[PDB]
Design an enzyme around this catalytic site. Structure first.
Site, short mmCIF file in Angstrom:
data_model
loop_
_atom_site.label_atom_id
_atom_site.label_comp_id
_atom_site.label_asym_id
_atom_site.label_seq_id
_atom_site.Cartn_x
_atom_site.Cartn_y
_atom_site.Cartn_z
CG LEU A 1 -106.82 56.28 -58.54
CD1 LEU A 1 -107.31 56.72 -60.05
CD2 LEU A 1 -107.32 54.90 -58.69
CG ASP A 2 -100.10 52.12 -56.00
OD1 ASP A 2 -99.17 52.98 -55.85
OD2 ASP A 2 -99.91 51.04 -55.67
CB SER A 3 -97.43 55.68 -58.27
OG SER A 3 -96.55 54.50 -57.37
CG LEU A 4 -97.50 50.66 -60.40
CD1 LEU A 4 -97.22 49.16 -60.51
CD2 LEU A 4 -96.48 51.27 -61.29
#
Ligand SMILES: CCCCCCCCCCCCCCCCCC(=O)OC[C@H](COP(=O)(O)OCCN)OC(=O)CCCCCCCCCCCCCCCCC
Ligand SMILES: CCCCCCCCCCCC(=O)OC[C@H](COP(=O)(O)OCC[N+](C)(C)C)OC(=O)CCCCCCCCCCC
Ligand SMILES: CCCCCCCCCCCC(=O)OC[C@H](COP(=O)(O)OCC[N+](C)(C)C)OC(=O)CCCCCCCCCCC
Lengths: 164, 125, 243, 47, 88, 83, 53, 246, 86, 108
Positions: free
Chosen positions: E43-46
């Protein structure tokens, strides 16, 4: 040994005061039922009084003792149920009886039910004193004490800062 | 921010710390303070006018700055009342006269004495 | 207790007994200056009370205010003014000692400090003290069926008669007394128990005896003030200079 | 051209399936209408 | 009336379901109490932010930054939701 | 006459009519209040009497309408006498 | 049996609530229709009290 | 006086239904934005709240119609000429009544859900102690108006014999001068805007969700009570506390 | 019961306190209903004499007498009604 | 100033801005479809500018986000009832269980 007006004025006073004196002895259960039932008896007195007044329309009075007869100022604790008074009583007494029955199921799980029910009947008794009184002074009594009782009810959760 | 009253008390503090006030109502509620209700830690220094800047003090509002708020409040009121005046010049006429009463305006039943009819006499007839 | 209850009432007895039966014409000439001074006493002391920190000092400021109302009434050249200003002095000498007992022989005995910032949340562990605080607070401010209202009303009747403007601009005492007393009562009875304060006993029977006496007496004169007229029906008319 | 899909749609789908559709969200409204229509017709017949 | 209580297993069932409905996950059967958000699930950091916003609406919470950015694991989120008496 | 007889001051004082209703039409208000006092002021009770007093006061309203028509006509006349 | 993402079942509302809800809706709508039938000219303004012109 | 009696009956009922709503939900929230579609779950609470809202919207035969439209009419029926504007201000207050009522009804019962799932598994109608008062108050808000309009709003009632000045009596002119337009427009609009804002909230919800910065600020004005709550504290209370400390 | 939490027991209030429901309340409830009923009866029977209807008490002939005497005092003191001075 | 484009502090910052923007959408919008649409549009607006490397344009963009978030503030945010800005916060606080400390030698 019957008085619509005397019973209208004393029974709410009983239901406000007896719990405050006797609540630890009676428990929130019986208090909820006693204040509910007494304020039910009061609502029936007012509906039947409303019928009679429609039949005749001579208001009853209740001239009690003197608060102040000094000099050009006679203020008695007079009371009366006229047409405007009996309508305000119909709203007050009916709504207060419903709320005393609705606030049993809403306020279960709440530890401090006794003080809640005592205050509801307190407000009821003081509005009854408001609409009834045959002088502006007896009105001012009910004016102040319902604002007092409103402070206590709105503050019923004394821990909640915003309520205070 | 140090307000007027709070920097008019500068000459008087002597040794007391000249703290920069911040009302607790705007402090982060999610932080753990010792006194979680008032949002104060134990040995937190107090401003000279802390009675204004605690939680028991009157509530602040952070949305509108107060000057624009006054503009909006008075502008709403003035719009309302000015519309309610202007619209009295755009009013239709009444479709019928006021009622009128038999006995000379009922001056007797209004508590007249044949000389105060101007004061007590209702509409003519 | 001795001071607020009696020594401040001596000033009122001094007026009625030295200053009115003699010096009548100077009273009826210099009364407006008295109304200035009493009015400033009322409002400024009430507003000064709004920003205090010590408990006992706040009750003290209230005593100044109620005496200033009582001066409006006694210095009004009317019967109702005399009978109100006296009843204020009596009911004040019942109510104020109770409050000084609460804030000086209860809380100061338990915790040895009078700053409001420590006190909060007494209702949880000290409920009976809460009930007494609110009753006495609503009697202090002049809730009816208490002598501190009947005296407020009568003195403001007579103050309104003498000078209607000053006697009506002084009706805001009905508000300002509520402000400086309820801003405090809400703090004490309100909120979660103070971390600074540990627990101590509820009020003992000695103090409950005292407060119940001082409340029964004011409730009585609040319910039937007419009992005190049997002594005062001459005094309401001896000191009236009206031709 | 302005069209994009939500990665959560399978989560936000139960807000639009059974007993939450444009039908079931409007059925129990006017709950006692039909009986009262029938009774009002009966009473006008009873005139 | 509201005779309902939460449990660690129930919180775990709801969190994994919340993550199974998430399209930007790598693929299913990586999701477990030991699952990381940035490494395992990919997963991204958003997306971590969107997942935390989702846990809030799911269990009726309000998670601030200083408690959110430290969630880098599903079991961490479970222990957190178990550490709010009002977790619905 | 669409109106009934006007009551005298004394019968008005006798029935204790309110002064707003103490007008030309007061004769039909009396039996209506009596039937209401009898039937406990229910709505299904004295419909005939209510109809009578209502029509009578409507007649008064129409008379007042025609008087307003006269006043408007007179003022337009005065206007187109001013020019 | 809790589908934390699935289509939820129908709620299992009691009979006293289904029976009474229908009773109040019956009486409401009946009281409306009966009043409107006996009182439409008044609420619609069809009686013209104004004199003929 | 009559509107007081009604206003008690069709407002205490609303507050009781609000409680039964708020407790059916798990977390006792008071936000319509997180209520959704409890209609199938809470029917009895629904029928009671809509009764009161219609007794608030002056639907025919309910107490609110008798108690409220007549005041909107006397605004036109008064002998004073400048009171005509108050008819419109009251009429705008009326269409606003049907707005915010139907808003609560849609947002709470008809709309798509906006909570979690567990709230809907555990929603349940509340006990007998809650319902029965709402039942009786519903009966009163249905029938009291026609039962008591012969006492209060009647023609020559003499029950509440307040000594009206004859010059100011206008109830006859109120009931007769009033035309069709000025007797129908309130009732028509109360139906039409009510159904309309329902249609918009259900089909064209963008209209309430533009995200314009000049609309959203006006929403911010009407939220926070026409910033008066911020006028009072800052300019009166705070400039009283500071003067007091001065 | 449901939703409870601990509470100090030594805290004593005239009211219940926390979830007050003592295991004798039927008896105390009987005592309280008895006192309340006796009080209501004592009050109603005591206040009966102090009641009266608004009307029917004072004959109109007495009212006419009193209004006559009012006119007598007014003219002896040579006073005029409100508005006549015009 | 030095707001580095690929460090933890900027990560905390932009994650907070993203949380705040989503909550603002959820509070402003009533319906759910439009909430998801605005959410996706914001995630697009963020991924579009996740790629910048110059600190100057980055910081200018962050300032623009600050101004935007200040321009769409909500005065009555949705918050859970049992949490600080809510209706049921300190409703029934369990009193701390404490023992009676004594103050006097003769009185209770
Ligand atoms: C400058 C010198 C003034 C001297 C004369 C006295 C003027 C009137 C009194 C004002 C003096 C300042 C009063 C300061 C008391 C403040 C006490 C306090 O700390 O409590 C704050 C309380 C509001 O509490 P809050 O924080 O807002 O909580 C809400 C969140 N739930 O505060 C309150 O609740 C407010 C209590 C006061 C209410 C007064 C309201 C006045 C509004 C007038 C509007 C105009 C109406 C027209 C009047 C006609 C006159 C002809
Ligand atoms: C008119 C002349 C006076 C009339 C007689 C009134 C006094 C009767 C004794 C009351 C005892 C009581 O109310 O209890 C005292 C209550 C206790 O609350 P609790 O319910 O027991 O729960 C206990 C839970 N605590 C411990 C967490 C609170 O303290 C309070 O919270 C402060 C509220 C005070 C209420 C005052 C009653 C209304 C009187 C106001 C009239 C001026
Ligand atoms: C004078 C004219 C100004 C009136 C105020 C306009 C508010 C603007 C707005 O857009 O507010 C719209 C809300 C309905 O929005 P919602 O979807 O139901 O939820 C709230 C969603 N918000 C927070 C995004 C707003 O209020 C209304 O129904 C107003 C409809 C106009 C009815 C007029 C009859």
């Amino acid at each position: 040994m019957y008085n619509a007006i005397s019973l209208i004025i004393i029974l709410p006073c009983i239901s406000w005061l007896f719990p405050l004196f006797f609540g630890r002895q009676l428990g929130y259960v019986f208090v909820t039922r006693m204040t509910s039932t007494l304020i039910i008896i009061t609502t029936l007195i007012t509906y039947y009084y409303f019928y009679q007044l429609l039949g005749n329309n001579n208001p009853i009075n209740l001239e009690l003792f003197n608060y102040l007869n000094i000099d050009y100022l006679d203020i008695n604790y007079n009371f009366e149920i006229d047409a405007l008074t009996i309508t305000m009583l119909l709203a007050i007494t009916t709504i207060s009886s419903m709320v005393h029955i609705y606030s049993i199921g809403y306020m279960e799980t709440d530890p401090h039910q006794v003080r809640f029910f005592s205050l509801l009947s307190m407000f009821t008794f003081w509005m009854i004193i408001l609409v009834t009184g045959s002088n502006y002074f007896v009105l001012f009594v009910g004016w102040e004490f319902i604002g007092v009782t409103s402070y206590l009810l709105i503050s019923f959760w004394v821990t909640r800062l915003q309520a205070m | 921010i140090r307000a007027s009253f709070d920097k008019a008390e500068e000459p008087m503090l002597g040794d007391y710390p000249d703290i920069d006030p911040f009302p607790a109502q705007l402090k982060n509620p999610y932080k753990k303070y010792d006194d979680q209700q008032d949002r104060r830690n134990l040995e937190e220094p107090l401003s000279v006018n802390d009675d204004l800047y605690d939680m028991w003090s009157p509530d602040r509002f952070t949305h509108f700055k107060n000057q624009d708020a006054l503009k909006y409040f008075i502008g709403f009121l003035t719009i309302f009342f000015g519309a309610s005046y202007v619209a009295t010049y755009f009013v239709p006429e009444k479709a019928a006269i006021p009622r009128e009463f038999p006995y000379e305006g009922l001056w007797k039943e209004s508590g007249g004495t044949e000389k105060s009819k101007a004061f007590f006499g209702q509409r003519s007839e | 207790m001795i001071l607020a209850g009696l020594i401040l009432k001596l000033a009122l007895y001094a007026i009625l007994r030295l200053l009115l039966p003699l010096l009548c014409e100077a009273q009826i000439l210099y009364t407006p200056m008295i109304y200035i001074i009493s009015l400033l006493t009322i409002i400024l002391t009430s507003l000064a009370t709004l920003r205090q920190i010590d408990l006992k000092v706040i009750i003290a400021y209230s005593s100044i205010s109620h005496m200033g109302i009582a001066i409006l009434g006694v210095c009004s050249n009317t019967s109702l003014g005399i009978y109100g200003s006296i009843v204020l002095g009596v009911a004040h000498g019942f109510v104020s000692p109770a409050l000084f007992l609460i804030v000086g022989g209860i809380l100061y005995d338990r915790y040895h400090i009078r700053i409001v910032n420590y006190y909060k949340g007494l209702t949880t562990y000290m409920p009976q003290l809460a009930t007494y605080i609110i009753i006495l607070s609503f009697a202090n401010i002049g809730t009816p069926l208490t002598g501190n209202f009947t005296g407020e009303f009568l003195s403001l009747q007579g103050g309104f008669i003498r000078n209607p403007i000053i006697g009506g601009i002084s009706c805001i005492s009905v508000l300002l007394a509520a402000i400086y007393q309820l801003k405090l009562t809400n703090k004490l009875t309100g909120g979660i128990s103070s971390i600074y304060m540990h627990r101590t006993n509820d009020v003992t029977i000695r103090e409950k005896f005292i407060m119940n006496i001082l409340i029964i007496s004011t409730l009585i004169i609040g319910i039937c003030p007419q009992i005190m007229y049997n002594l005062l029906y001459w005094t309401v008319n001896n000191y009236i200079y009206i031709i | 051209a302005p069209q994009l899909k939500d990665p959560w749609a399978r989560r936000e789908a139960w807000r639009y399936q059974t007993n939450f559709t444009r039908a079931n969200r409007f059925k129990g409204a006017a709950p006692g209408f039909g009986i009262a229509v029938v009774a009002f017709g009966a009473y006008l017949a009873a005139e | 009336s509201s005779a309902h209580v939460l449990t660690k297993d129930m919180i775990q069932e709801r969190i994994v379901a919340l993550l199974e409905s998430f399209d930007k996950v790598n693929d299913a059967k990586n999701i477990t109490a030991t699952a990381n958000l940035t490494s395992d699930l990919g997963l991204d950091s958003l997306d971590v932010v969107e997942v935390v916003m989702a846990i809030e609406e799911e269990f009726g919470l309000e998670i601030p930054d200083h408690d959110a950015d430290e969630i880098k694991t599903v079991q961490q989120a479970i222990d957190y939701v178990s550490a709010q008496p009002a977790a619905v | 006459a669409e109106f009934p007889p006007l009551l005298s001051q004394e019968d008005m004082k006798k029935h204790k009519i309110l002064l707003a209703y103490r007008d030309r039409c007061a004769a039909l208000l009396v039996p209506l209040n009596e039937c209401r006092k009898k039937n406990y002021y229910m709505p299904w009770a004295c419909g005939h009497e209510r109809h009578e007093y209502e029509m009578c006061e409507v007649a008064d309203f129409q008379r007042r309408v025609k008087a307003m028509d006269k006043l408007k006509a007179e003022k337009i006349e005065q206007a187109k006498a001013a020019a | 049996n809790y589908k934390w993402n699935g289509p939820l079942p129908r709620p299992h509302v009691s009979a006293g609530h289904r029976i009474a809800t229908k009773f109040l809706g019956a009486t409401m709508f009946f009281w409306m229709f009966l009043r409107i039938k006996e009182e439409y000219p008044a609420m619609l303004g069809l009686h013209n009290f104004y004199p003929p012109k | 006086l009559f509107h007081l009696l009604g206003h008690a009956f069709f407002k205490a009922l609303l507050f009781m239904s609000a409680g039964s709503i708020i407790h059916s939900i798990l977390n006792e929230s008071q936000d319509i934005r997180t209520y959704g579609g409890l209609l199938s779950y809470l029917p009895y609470t629904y029928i009671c709240i809509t009764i009161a809202s219609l007794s608030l919207m002056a639907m025919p035969g309910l107490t609110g119609y008798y108690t409220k439209d007549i005041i909107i009419e006397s605004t036109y029926g008064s002998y004073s000429i400048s009171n005509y504007v108050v008819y419109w201000i009251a009429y705008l207050s009326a269409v606003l009544t049907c707005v915010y009522s139907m808003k609560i009804l849609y947002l709470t019962f008809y709309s798509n859900p906006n909570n979690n799932t567990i709230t809907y598994y555990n929603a349940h109608e509340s006990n007998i102690y809650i319902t029965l008062p709402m039942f009786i108050l519903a009966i009163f808000a249905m029938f009291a108006g026609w039962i008591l309009k012969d006492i209060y709003l009647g023609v020559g009632t003499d029950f509440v014999g307040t000594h009206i000045l004859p010059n100011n009596f206008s109830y006859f002119d109120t009931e007769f001068s009033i035309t069709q337009f000025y007797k129908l427009l309130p009732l028509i609009s109360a139906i039409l805007v009510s159904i309309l804002i329902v249609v918009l909230n259900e089909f064209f919800a963008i209209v309430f969700n533009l995200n314009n910065k000049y609309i959203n600020t006006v929403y911010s004005i009407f939220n926070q009570k026409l910033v008066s709550d911020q006028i009072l504290n800052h300019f009166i209370i705070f400039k009283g506390l500071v003067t007091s400390g001065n | 019961g449901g939703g409870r939490y601990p509470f100090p027991k030594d805290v004593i209030s005239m009211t219940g306190g926390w979830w007050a429901n003592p295991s004798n309340w039927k008896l105390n409830g009987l005592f309280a209903t008895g006192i309340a009923v006796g009080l209501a009866l004592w009050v109603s029977t005591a206040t009966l004499p102090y009641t009266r209807r608004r009307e029917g008490i004072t004959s109109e002939s007495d009212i006419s007498k009193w209004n006559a005497a009012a006119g007598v005092w007014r003219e002896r003191h040579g006073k005029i009604s409100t508005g006549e001075a015009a | 100033s030095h707001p580095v484009p690929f460090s933890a502090a900027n990560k905390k910052l932009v994650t907070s801005m993203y949380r705040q923007s989503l909550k603002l959408a959820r509070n402003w919008i009533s319906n759910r479809q439009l909430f998801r649409q605005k959410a996706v549009e914001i995630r697009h607006k963020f991924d579009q500018n996740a790629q910048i490397s110059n600190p100057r344009l980055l910081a200018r963009t962050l300032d623009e986000t600050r101004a935007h978030l200040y321009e769409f503030r909500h005065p009555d945010p949705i918050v859970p009832p049992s949490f600080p800005g809510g209706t049921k916060y300190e409703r029934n606080v369990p009193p701390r269980m404490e023992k009676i400390m004594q103050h006097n030698l003769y009185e209770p």
